[model samples]
Target chain A: QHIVPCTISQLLSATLVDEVFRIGNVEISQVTIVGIIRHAEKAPTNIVYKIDDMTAAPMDVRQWVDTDNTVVPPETYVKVAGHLRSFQNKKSLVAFKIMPLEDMNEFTTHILEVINAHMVLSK
Target chain B: NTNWKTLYEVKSENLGQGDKPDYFSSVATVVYLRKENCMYQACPTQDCNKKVIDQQNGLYRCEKCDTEFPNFKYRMILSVNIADFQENQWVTCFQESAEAILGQNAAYLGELKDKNEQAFEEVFQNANFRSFIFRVRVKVEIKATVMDVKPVDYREYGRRLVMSIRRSALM
Candidate 1:
């Protein structure tokens, strides 16, 4: 019920990323972001993917998974649903679901949802 | 959402409280509720809800505001024991949640309590054994406090049940 459609840029804003805020009565410290993968690397147990949505700074999405089997390469766009976690001052997404996008049109749809969220939440 | 657990489950697991707060949710009944000491006759300053200290010299001081005031307001600090069928747990509620439970503002309750203690006690007694959807914050001190307490809405409960079943099916 608390799912929000938002861009990486919106999630990275100081108000959201720097501090936890409430949406309705729900305490939201994490958010979902859709972006294109720039690079991927292994961190022993976790797989980290650098993603960007062209609206803001690139962010690292981490998932504790065996990444060797997956074929997702750099430059492929994907939808990552997860929490925006902060340790010290740095920020990252601890992904829950990472799905490769088949249609390029869905990227624009995500942006539209972000705009809609702004309109929906402000009231 | 992922980590939401029942009061019974949390109690069974005995999730040792860490430094940071943990969260849980339950549909629980308010049992063994006490409203006698559930309020503060405090400074009425807007946004600075602090307890007023009586000087006993015809003056009161709000140290939080650093001002002496002739007027003040009531703040609620309700503590109640709740049960989720599996088990019961005690939780504390601050002003807003307490107001929601009382179905009246603290100021109103304070006036009632001051004017007629028996009437005020009767009003609170009526709220006993009611159920609600509670979101709780579990602190390191092993205390669970109510962060949000919503009235038991059947539609919402039904929705949660549907969602729960679907989620379990996926698993």
Candidate 2:
């Protein structure tokens, strides 16, 4: 799957803080985020997570709630997408639309290859 | 540039121990590094981390809330040149690192600036001598943990190029 890299600055730039007040009334569009999982909290009915892109600041996001299922062990390097919402004065992207990026290994491998190539050229 | 060197690798166990005073007093781990042109804006508020945009005509706007606020501080992350036997590199730290060095609470710093300029100056002065060791802990397996540490002289080089995070110490 294609991954879109996002920085904290970019996320902050695109974030609509005002949207938080519009909870239950706002509709979320599909957006992808690549960031480190800064926080992952479990709840009886849902799992809450915070991701930091290191550009602006970390923001909270939750997975879409399911009756008997929960997302486990939020990895440090995670890329996910889903519906965005604002809850309890914070903006969150829910998981119902969440999809983890699986090609991260390949992505890192490609980056390492490029770095090695650059090193060879420099030498 | 040759005057700078990677004194050491920062490890998680020794994340905030250093010789320098921090501006914000809070320990924050470096999580990212970008080797590109960057800008530092004086937060409109005394110690807020918000970046302000030049509105021209002596006014600045905060990019976070799109609100115009009076300028209070001159902020800039200096780029310093460092070298090692293997490579030469330039590194810098942003406001977050600066805040970490200062050890002053962002909101409290703002209050200090508003209430006592002299006190604010004192805090700022102390920050100049503040040093830091950035570190990250990585878990190798369910039981193994590795720590990396990097010493940073914020007074000489105003940035942190090392990025790190904490993971399970044991596998």
Candidate 3:
């Protein structure tokens, strides 16, 4: 198994994701997800939001689908699972599973720190 | 409409390496015409294509050379005009295209120009003729900056398109 630990900056400037995918020269079974909130969209089925790291390349992720009329707003910190796919000339992450970081108190605190730091610097 | 008339037509064997059939048609409408004895201020250093910019001071700067040189070589850019389904388009000549049009290098032409002005005339007189096709791909990118204060809206503007000639040989 080949694994490549990439920062947001590294992915943003990459001309070809396949180049990064070939890092360990072994097949990739899974990918790690990390990013910050950029924008969010609320839909009847699920909530989608655009997230970006410190880098320029941004990706969109969808939270859980509503069944009992549960409304999940934007600005929710989440950990996602997905596979990388290429469409047209660009690569995107299609998330299949997502969980709120708040559920895990330990991880939630660290994520909040990251969010606050991003907001302050962006200001 | 300008009456399309056949300009001078010559036999293939009589044409020079650079001469082609489309060359004459282009000349008829004053499009895609090759310049003779044209000169450009090329970089003085070897393998440096950057042109020297006259700083209007005592020194000249070569972006590639990164050093001042008293002089540089003079090159030419062939200019071409073509009529398409949409409209007439003007294309700037590349170095390789110019070399193909001239059937010789700048140094070769410089020598001929020095020996006899008529030497260039003979070279152009025997050039070959052919039609040219141009295909291009365009890409556009939009950028915006968002500030932390205010409404936190990311405002983006401007559109850019990049075109490149397609073909393995051309690449």
Candidate 4:
């Protein structure tokens, strides 16, 4: 399946109890979201970021990093590709890839892409 | 450039007027680089990227850390003009990204500046007209700093165009 483009709000809107996250009436495990990094917290093995897309609640995205990799600074816009994780009924993201946007126009495209993806999926 | 903004739009918005800084990305060419004072001696501490003051002795002093060390690290703050199809903007590139643009590490470049001025001049000359994808932050009026820099990926870019066309067809 393709990586679903989504808003943080849509990910948070999933009503699944024990199965795959269903967004736009389709079961999805992987997703792509663009947002601003509000805060970044680094641990020994992971760097977790609180990201906001301005659609709904901010979400925590955790990435297991290595010594060579540096964390993306706060207040910067980035594109995150990851799968949803659920624990204790709380939802979050485990990112495999996080990239800084080189063109802000991607921001507008992401917003429209989300709508297009959902429209096509639901139908 | 799937959905990148024009340089004109970023500048015309006057984003610096806001309470918080605004962030955006642009794909632009390195039109000019201010190489005169690009590299500087910085604190050797891994956590501190601050410039260090030479005490005229063997020690370097870091005001932020309140410490003095015999050794210092070379860091860069490169000011360059970046241009897109519509317009151009002056953006500052610090340390890592600066190294990426210059194609050399700060330590080697710093020594190159002192040992060979012509070679140093050629470095900047070679870097001109080269294009890159830049992530920039607008913190004040007409002042932007690049958060990241990367070479243009044509293969990835072509895939995006195909995906974009597929999405449009679906719509």
Q: What is the interface RMSD of each candidate, in Å?
A: 15.3, 17.4, 24.2, 14.8
**Candidate 2 vs candidate 3, TM-score winner:** 3
Q: What DockQ does predicted model 1 obtain?
A: 0.01
Write model 3 residue lDDT over B44-101, tens digit each, in one string.
Answer: 6777767678776745688875788776565655454433111233344555555555
Q: Report chain B TM per candidate.
A: 0.86, 0.33, 0.42, 0.86
Model 3, position B85, has a per-residue lDDT of 12
> Candidate 2 regions off by >4 Å?
A1-8, A15-28, A68-70, A86-89, A105-123, B1-171
List the lowest-lDDT window of 10 residues for candidate 3 chain A. A22-31
lDDT of 1: 0.69
Quote the positional error of residue A56 for candidate 4 in Å.
Answer: 54
Candidate lDDT scores, in order, read 0.69, 0.41, 0.41, 0.78
Q: What would the per-residue lDDT of candidate 1 be over residues B50-160, giving only the tens digit for each residue?
A: 778988876778988898988778888988887642357888999888888778888878788878878888657657655577888887647888899886554555555
Interface DockQ per candidate: 0.01, 0.01, 0.01, 0.01
**Residue B166 displacement in candidate 2 (angstroms):** 36
Query: Per-residue CA lDDT of candidate 4, range A29-104, in tens?
Result: 6677899999999887999999999998899999987675578999999977777787676879998678788877
Report lDDT (Cα) of residue B167, candidate 1: 65
Candidate with top lDDT is: 4
Model 4 docking tier (incorrect/acceptable/medium/high): incorrect
